[PDB]
Design a protein around this ligand. Sequence first.
Ligand SMILES: Nc1nc2c(ncn2[C@@H]2O[C@H](COP(=O)(O)OP(=O)(O)OP(=O)(O)O)[C@@H](O)[C@H]2O)c(=O)[nH]1
Ligand SMILES: [Mn+2]
Length: 283
Amino acid sequence: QRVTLTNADKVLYPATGTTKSDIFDYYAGVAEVMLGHIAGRPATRKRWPNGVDQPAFFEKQLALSAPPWLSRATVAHRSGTTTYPIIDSATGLAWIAQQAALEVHVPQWRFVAEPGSGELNPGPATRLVFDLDPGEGVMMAQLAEVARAVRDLLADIGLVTFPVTSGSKGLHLYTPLDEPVSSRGATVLAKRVAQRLEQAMPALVTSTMTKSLRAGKVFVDWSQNSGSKTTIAPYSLRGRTHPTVAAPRTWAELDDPALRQLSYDEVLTRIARDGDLLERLDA
Ligand SMILES: Nc1nc2c(ncn2[C@@H]2O[C@H](COP(=O)(O)OP(=O)(O)OP(=O)(O)O)[C@@H](O)[C@H]2O)c(=O)[nH]1
Ligand SMILES: [Mn+2]
């Protein structure tokens, strides 16, 4: 289990001078809190080899050159088969940094080992996710109000919801599923939540993607519960002008109208103070 960090001094975020080495330091720093929420999941790497002012790609297939110690599993998609890495150790996060994989994206299900053969196949959804996107003119205050409304509807079912500022423009919400549920079943439940909210507050919420009608509304994207979709991992850096993070928040923080995205240094400071706000999500 060995990684050599090359171009450690290469700036990946020109705006802030943040380097590959800084990204390595960050991922080392968040390893203990981040690994639980990506354990057992295929990791998709969004890479910016020349930094955030240069092109990115969304890399799913594991390269032939990938180190032999990386855990991996295969997924049959509608075209064929893809081998993914599974990130489950500090060394794995060191590899992520070396790859300039600023963002780590995962589905809401984990691999499960076969009864007799120990072969890894996709298992049930372990959590629901909601991806909340602000339409034009929509401020953080409205995103937070809609997030509370999602939380309340799920609370009517005895489900708990954890808020995450995405690091980009919106909010992500996670709710742990106590009993096993298929990704199909998860997508149905999430869609019904979204639709219920849109019916209750059609001027403030939409459950459909079409952008012509998104202005003034929060689009509550329920579709990333699909087995074939991903959502950025909690604690992931973002490939944006600033090295912001998909940062777990408290509901009390969401009562602040000045609510904003957090930078990676802030997230480290918060972990030092409070540990993992998502500790109960994948326990
Ligand atoms: N195919 C593909 N999917 C992507 C790519 N980048 C992100 N995704 C996925 O597309 C969806 C939206 O991702 P993003 O655009 O990063 O949105 P976000 O993290 O919710 O950030 P904001 O909406 O800006 O707050 C998620 O399902 C991601 O896993 C990409 O380059 N290619
Ligand atoms: Mn979004």
